[PDB]
Scaffold this active site. Structure first.
Site, mmCIF file in Angstrom:
data_model
loop_
_atom_site.group_PDB
_atom_site.id
_atom_site.type_symbol
_atom_site.label_atom_id
_atom_site.label_comp_id
_atom_site.label_asym_id
_atom_site.label_seq_id
_atom_site.Cartn_x
_atom_site.Cartn_y
_atom_site.Cartn_z
ATOM 1 N N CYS A 1 -8.121 14.304 13.816
ATOM 2 C CA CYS A 1 -8.780 14.907 12.648
ATOM 3 C C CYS A 1 -8.023 14.719 11.340
ATOM 4 O O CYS A 1 -6.868 15.122 11.226
ATOM 5 C CB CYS A 1 -8.950 16.414 12.900
ATOM 6 S SG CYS A 1 -9.711 17.289 11.519
ATOM 7 N N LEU A 2 -8.658 14.094 10.355
ATOM 8 C CA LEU A 2 -8.069 13.994 9.021
ATOM 9 C C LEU A 2 -8.043 15.319 8.261
ATOM 10 O O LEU A 2 -7.180 15.526 7.385
ATOM 11 C CB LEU A 2 -8.830 12.958 8.193
ATOM 12 C CG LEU A 2 -8.636 11.487 8.559
ATOM 13 C CD1 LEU A 2 -9.510 10.641 7.630
ATOM 14 C CD2 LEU A 2 -7.155 11.090 8.396
ATOM 15 N N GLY A 3 -8.977 16.210 8.593
ATOM 16 C CA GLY A 3 -9.069 17.507 7.908
ATOM 17 C C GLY A 3 -8.183 18.594 8.489
ATOM 18 O O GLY A 3 -8.298 19.738 8.080
ATOM 19 N N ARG B 1 -27.051 22.335 14.380
ATOM 20 C CA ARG B 1 -27.592 23.385 15.241
ATOM 21 C C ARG B 1 -29.045 23.054 15.626
ATOM 22 O O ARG B 1 -29.956 23.785 15.247
ATOM 23 C CB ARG B 1 -27.525 24.735 14.530
ATOM 24 C CG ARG B 1 -26.110 25.109 14.144
ATOM 25 C CD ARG B 1 -26.051 25.539 12.716
ATOM 26 N NE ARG B 1 -24.678 25.708 12.252
ATOM 27 C CZ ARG B 1 -24.303 26.655 11.394
ATOM 28 N NH1 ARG B 1 -25.200 27.518 10.924
ATOM 29 N NH2 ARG B 1 -23.030 26.745 11.011
ATOM 30 N N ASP C 1 -19.093 23.369 10.829
ATOM 31 C CA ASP C 1 -19.251 24.156 12.079
ATOM 32 C C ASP C 1 -17.947 24.402 12.824
ATOM 33 O O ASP C 1 -17.757 25.472 13.410
ATOM 34 C CB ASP C 1 -20.304 23.537 13.022
ATOM 35 C CG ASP C 1 -21.730 23.952 12.658
ATOM 36 O OD1 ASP C 1 -22.677 23.573 13.388
ATOM 37 O OD2 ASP C 1 -21.909 24.661 11.637
ATOM 38 N N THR C 2 -17.049 23.415 12.784
ATOM 39 C CA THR C 2 -15.710 23.570 13.352
ATOM 40 C C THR C 2 -15.008 24.791 12.764
ATOM 41 O O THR C 2 -14.566 25.660 13.509
ATOM 42 C CB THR C 2 -14.847 22.302 13.142
ATOM 43 O OG1 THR C 2 -14.951 21.889 11.779
ATOM 44 C CG2 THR C 2 -15.347 21.172 14.036
HETATM 45 C C1 HEM Z 1 -10.869 23.943 13.163
HETATM 46 C C2 HEM Z 1 -11.279 22.912 12.399
HETATM 47 C C3 HEM Z 1 -11.456 21.460 12.899
HETATM 48 C C4 HEM Z 1 -11.476 20.952 14.151
HETATM 49 C C5 HEM Z 1 -11.248 21.673 15.496
HETATM 50 C C6 HEM Z 1 -11.687 19.528 14.042
HETATM 51 C C7 HEM Z 1 -11.789 18.648 15.097
HETATM 52 C C8 HEM Z 1 -11.886 17.282 14.980
HETATM 53 C C9 HEM Z 1 -11.827 16.357 16.086
HETATM 54 C C10 HEM Z 1 -11.629 16.770 17.556
HETATM 55 C C11 HEM Z 1 -11.962 15.112 15.602
HETATM 56 C C12 HEM Z 1 -11.900 13.772 16.397
HETATM 57 C C13 HEM Z 1 -13.247 13.416 17.028
HETATM 58 C C14 HEM Z 1 -13.203 12.149 17.860
HETATM 59 O O1 HEM Z 1 -12.103 11.667 18.251
HETATM 60 O O2 HEM Z 1 -14.314 11.620 18.178
HETATM 61 C C15 HEM Z 1 -12.107 15.213 14.161
HETATM 62 C C16 HEM Z 1 -12.247 14.159 13.294
HETATM 63 C C17 HEM Z 1 -12.402 14.251 11.927
HETATM 64 N N1 HEM Z 1 -12.404 15.426 11.146
HETATM 65 FE FE1 HEM Z 1 -12.059 17.321 11.922
HETATM 66 N N2 HEM Z 1 -11.857 19.204 12.717
HETATM 67 C C18 HEM Z 1 -11.712 20.363 11.975
HETATM 68 C C19 HEM Z 1 -11.770 20.473 10.609
HETATM 69 C C20 HEM Z 1 -12.031 19.424 9.710
HETATM 70 C C21 HEM Z 1 -12.188 19.537 8.264
HETATM 71 C C22 HEM Z 1 -12.033 20.820 7.419
HETATM 72 C C23 HEM Z 1 -12.494 18.330 7.769
HETATM 73 C C24 HEM Z 1 -12.715 18.007 6.272
HETATM 74 C C25 HEM Z 1 -13.757 17.254 5.930
HETATM 75 C C26 HEM Z 1 -12.521 17.399 8.883
HETATM 76 C C27 HEM Z 1 -12.728 16.045 8.767
HETATM 77 C C28 HEM Z 1 -12.621 15.131 9.796
HETATM 78 C C29 HEM Z 1 -12.753 13.707 9.641
HETATM 79 C C30 HEM Z 1 -13.032 12.911 8.346
HETATM 80 C C31 HEM Z 1 -12.602 13.128 11.051
HETATM 81 C C32 HEM Z 1 -12.700 11.646 11.457
HETATM 82 C C33 HEM Z 1 -11.372 10.938 11.499
HETATM 83 C C34 HEM Z 1 -11.599 9.541 12.069
HETATM 84 O O3 HEM Z 1 -12.655 9.234 12.686
HETATM 85 O O4 HEM Z 1 -10.680 8.721 11.905
HETATM 86 N N3 HEM Z 1 -12.215 18.099 10.048
HETATM 87 N N4 HEM Z 1 -12.050 16.547 13.816
HETATM 88 C C1 LIG Z 2 -32.616 16.244 27.121
HETATM 89 N N1 LIG Z 2 -32.099 15.308 26.125
HETATM 90 C C2 LIG Z 2 -32.063 13.889 26.449
HETATM 91 C C3 LIG Z 2 -31.714 15.775 24.845
HETATM 92 C C4 LIG Z 2 -32.372 15.206 23.748
HETATM 93 C C5 LIG Z 2 -32.066 15.614 22.455
HETATM 94 C C6 LIG Z 2 -31.105 16.606 22.254
HETATM 95 C C7 LIG Z 2 -30.430 17.205 23.329
HETATM 96 C C8 LIG Z 2 -29.454 18.199 23.102
HETATM 97 S S1 LIG Z 2 -29.082 18.741 21.612
HETATM 98 O O1 LIG Z 2 -30.324 19.114 20.962
HETATM 99 O O2 LIG Z 2 -28.262 19.912 21.775
HETATM 100 N N2 LIG Z 2 -28.381 17.592 20.723
HETATM 101 C C9 LIG Z 2 -26.974 17.267 20.861
HETATM 102 C C10 LIG Z 2 -26.158 17.812 19.687
HETATM 103 C C11 LIG Z 2 -26.034 16.788 18.569
HETATM 104 C C12 LIG Z 2 -25.064 17.280 17.500
HETATM 105 C C13 LIG Z 2 -24.470 16.095 16.750
HETATM 106 C C14 LIG Z 2 -24.180 16.461 15.301
HETATM 107 C C15 LIG Z 2 -23.375 15.364 14.639
HETATM 108 C C16 LIG Z 2 -22.554 15.950 13.504
HETATM 109 N N3 LIG Z 2 -21.200 16.178 14.024
HETATM 110 C C17 LIG Z 2 -20.224 15.253 13.991
HETATM 111 O O3 LIG Z 2 -20.427 14.158 13.495
HETATM 112 C C18 LIG Z 2 -18.856 15.613 14.533
HETATM 113 C C19 LIG Z 2 -17.949 14.370 14.568
HETATM 114 C C20 LIG Z 2 -16.540 14.774 15.051
HETATM 115 C C21 LIG Z 2 -16.645 15.420 16.442
HETATM 116 C C22 LIG Z 2 -17.578 16.646 16.427
HETATM 117 C C23 LIG Z 2 -16.975 17.665 15.454
HETATM 118 C C24 LIG Z 2 -16.884 17.038 14.056
HETATM 119 O O4 LIG Z 2 -16.390 18.007 13.139
HETATM 120 C C25 LIG Z 2 -15.992 15.792 14.058
HETATM 121 C C26 LIG Z 2 -18.283 16.654 13.572
HETATM 122 C C27 LIG Z 2 -18.973 16.219 15.942
HETATM 123 C C28 LIG Z 2 -28.812 18.776 24.205
HETATM 124 C C29 LIG Z 2 -29.104 18.360 25.502
HETATM 125 C C30 LIG Z 2 -30.064 17.365 25.719
HETATM 126 C C31 LIG Z 2 -30.737 16.782 24.637
#
Ligand code: HEM
Ligand SMILES: CN(C)c1cccc2c(S(=O)(=O)NCCCCCCCCNC(=O)[C@@]34C[C@@H]5C[C@@H](C[C@@](O)(C5)C3)C4)cccc12
Ligand SMILES: [K+]
Length: 405
Positions: free
Chosen positions: A348-350, A177, A242-243
């Site tokens: 998604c593995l989760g 966030r 956050d998901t």
């Molecule tokens: C409503 C709940 C969830 C949603 C909508 C969701 C969504 C996703 C999506 C869209 C991706 C694929 C991202 C990509 O292709 O770049 C992903 C990957 C993944 N998620 Fe979730 N997720 C959820 C819950 C969880 C939970 C509970 C876990 C447990 C830790 C988890 C673990 C992972 C992992 C490890 C991957 C990576 C798999 C890989 O890269 O091979 N997720 N998730």
């Molecule tokens: C003006 N410029 C250049 C800017 C500069 C700096 C910031 C900016 C932002 S910004 O401040 O809004 N930043 C973008 C948001 C970054 C969030 C990434 C968090 C990674 C963790 N999540 C995962 O790995 C994931 C990996 C998978 C896919 C999802 C859901 C997951 O479950 C599974 C967790 C994410 C908005 C707009 C412009 C910006």
């Protein structure tokens, strides 16, 4: 700012969608994204917002790009480009073939057999949270149930002490966030600083928790490195937070506003698993993407090497081509098509753990607090981004209509 249109992009494909602040977000975030699916909008468009990038707007193209990792790489999966570049989580920043065995290792710690074992602990946690709220007749659901729930599940999985929750919540919130005060790279380093010593400790004296399993695993015929273990653990922590928080919130907002759908689940709790799937489709919330590995013609459009493409997981199930009357919720929908958990090699593995968190929450909430509403006078505010969400969810109920189970 709008970035200048690169000369390979034809002007007829330009639709300046802002994924971090879409226009008429006030109407609901899914509705705000669904503007991309109006009949005058091409299947593949370019926006000049957020540095400039492609967006695939229809399920067919979203699925195809997620399948084609050779052209559409996860090395840089986030908009804006600078965030995608600093990102090194495993397996999400890796492409096959290398990704395959890292994924296999992560699956040992969140996969199906682990979920079956966790079922009762998930239920006990949900019950304890709901019972603490029940007699009060009000809560902010997002803050009081949704935020505490998946982090506690992670602590159990990873064998981490309860006392660490507030600090770990602080570190994860900083990253997912962002308020503009720190880069992704800075937030990542602060998260890694917590994980690094624990990984060191558990490589020396391994236990049976998720971090021990990951940090002592074998990948591609050799021991995982301390660096790789940290990059995996960061994802295992963040991926289920956050998901789940935001998805539970969208679901509970809908049920608060729809007493007829609520009543369906109260009378027929056996339909809750199907309901969970329909809610996953309708309140889908993730939108990440990929980077072009080479120049490539994709559905008649010239893409250039290094272009970013947003492939919103959210949009596939909202596409009328995939599901008729896509904004209508029907828990008896015969074929619920979606890519809410993604598609292709990174699916998604989760997902199994997530469905149990969702179904357990709904079953336990509807049993204890069947009758609830949005707080009188409240207007629910949504937020948009890589994981779209609910800012706050004030709920109210009469404790006399509840039951301590
Ligand atoms: C409503 C709940 C969830 C949603 C909508 C969701 C969504 C996703 C999506 C869209 C991706 C694929 C991202 C990509 O292709 O770049 C992903 C990957 C993944 N998620 Fe979730 N997720 C959820 C819950 C969880 C939970 C509970 C876990 C447990 C830790 C988890 C673990 C992972 C992992 C490890 C991957 C990576 C798999 C890989 O890269 O091979 N997720 N998730
Ligand atoms: C003006 N410029 C250049 C800017 C500069 C700096 C910031 C900016 C932002 S910004 O401040 O809004 N930043 C973008 C948001 C970054 C969030 C990434 C968090 C990674 C963790 N999540 C995962 O790995 C994931 C990996 C998978 C896919 C999802 C859901 C997951 O479950 C599974 C967790 C994410 C908005 C707009 C412009 C910006
Ligand atoms: K990267």
């Amino acid at each position: 700012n709008l970035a200048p249109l690169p000369p390979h992009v034809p002007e007829h494909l330009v639709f300046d969608f802002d994924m971090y602040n879409p226009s008429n977000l006030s109407a609901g975030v899914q509705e705000a994204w669904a503007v991309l699916q109006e009949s005058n909008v091409p299947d593949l468009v370019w926006t000049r917002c957020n540095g400039g990038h492609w967006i695939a707007t229809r399920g067919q193209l979203i699925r195809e790009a997620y399948e084609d990792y050779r052209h559409f790489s996860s090395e840089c999966p986030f908009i804006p480009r600078e965030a995608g570049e600093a990102y090194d989580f495993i397996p999400t920043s890796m492409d096959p073939p290398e990704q395959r065995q890292f994924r296999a290792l992560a699956n040992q710690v969140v996969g199906m057999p682990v979920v079956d074992k966790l079922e009762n602990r998930i239920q006990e946690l949900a019950c304890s949270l709901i019972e603490s709220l029940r007699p009060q007749g009000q809560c902010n659901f997002t803050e009081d149930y949704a935020e505490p729930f998946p982090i506690r599940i992670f602590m159990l999985l990873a064998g981490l002490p309860e006392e660490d929750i507030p600090h770990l919540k602080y570190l994860t919130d900083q990253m997912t966030r962002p308020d503009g005060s720190m880069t992704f790279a800075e937030a990542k380093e602060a998260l890694y600083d917590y994980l690094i010593p624990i990984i060191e400790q558990r490589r020396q004296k391994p236990g049976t928790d998720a971090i021990s399993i990951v940090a002592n695993g074998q990948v591609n015929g050799r021991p995982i490195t301390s660096d790789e273990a940290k990059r995996m653990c960061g994802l295992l922590l963040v991926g289920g937070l956050d998901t789940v928080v935001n998805f539970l919130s969208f679901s509970m907002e809908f049920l608060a506003k729809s007493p007829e759908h609520r009543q369906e689940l109260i009378e027929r709790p056996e339909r809750i698993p199907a309901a969970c799937e329909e809610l996953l489709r309708r309140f889908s919330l993730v939108a990440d993407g990929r980077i072009l590995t080479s120049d490539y013609e994709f559905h008649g459009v010239q893409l250039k090497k290094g272009d970013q493409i947003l492939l919103p997981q959210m949009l596939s199930g909202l596409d009328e081509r995939e599901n008729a009357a896509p904004m209508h919720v029907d828990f008896s929908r015969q074929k619920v098509s979606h890519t809410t958990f993604g598609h292709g090699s990174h699916l998604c593995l989760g997902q199994h753990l997530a469905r149990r968190e969702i179904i357990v929450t709904l079953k336990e909430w509807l049993t204890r607090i069947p009758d609830f509403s949005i707080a009188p006078g409240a207007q629910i505010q949504h937020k948009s981004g890589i994981v779209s969400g609910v800012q706050a969810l004030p709920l109210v109920w009469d404790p006399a209509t509840t039951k301590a189970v």
